[PDB]
Design a protein around this ligand. Structure first.
Ligand SMILES: Cc1cn([C@H]2C[C@H](OP(=O)(O)O)[C@@H](COP(=O)(O)O)O2)c(=O)[nH]c1=O
Ligand SMILES: [Ca+2]
Length: 129
């Protein structure tokens, strides 16, 4: 897989963000994770975590997997990197997202993220507390 440029347009919630990609505005949904909705427990904390990560970065990058690049809603499906650090993994490692929506053919980083989840759950963090 390859990292490609994007620029933050606006934070949305723990697993979605609006970014400009190839010069067009898109809503991205993070691959392989599920954060709580803003109205659910840890929802606001997941939103805040992603917002800080993406806003504070000097650069963001999007990395598509081998399969579908957009979902049925027209959202981009990607791994999003903030100054080289993967937001999808960082959410899972903090217990602010579960590994989820693991579809065959768009699951390159599955095991990386499952390892992060096992660590979060061993540490009883957030959703696992
Ligand atoms: C993460 C991801 C979500 N989706 C779809 C499945 C879910 O459909 P439904 O809307 O019918 O439940 C929805 C979950 O997104 P949200 O967690 O953002 O609600 O997005 C994909 O199709 N591909 C994906 O990789
Ligand atoms: Ca969600």
């Amino acid at each position: 897989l390859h990292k490609e440029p994007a620029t933050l347009i606006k934070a949305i919630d723990g697993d979605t963000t609006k970014a400009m990609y190839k010069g067009q505005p898109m809503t991205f949904r993070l691959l392989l994770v599920d954060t709580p909705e803003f109205n659910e427990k840890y929802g606001p904390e997941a939103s805040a975590f992603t917002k800080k990560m993406v806003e504070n970065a000097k650069k963001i990058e999007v990395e598509f997997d081998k399969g579908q690049r957009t979902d049925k809603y027209g959202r981009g499906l990607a791994y999003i990197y903030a100054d080289g650090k993967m937001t999808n993994e960082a959410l899972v490692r903090q217990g602010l997202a579960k590994v989820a929506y693991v579809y065959k053919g768009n699951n390159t980083h599955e095991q990386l993220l499952r390892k992060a989840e096992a660590q979060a759950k061993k540490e009883k963090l957030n959703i696992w507390s």
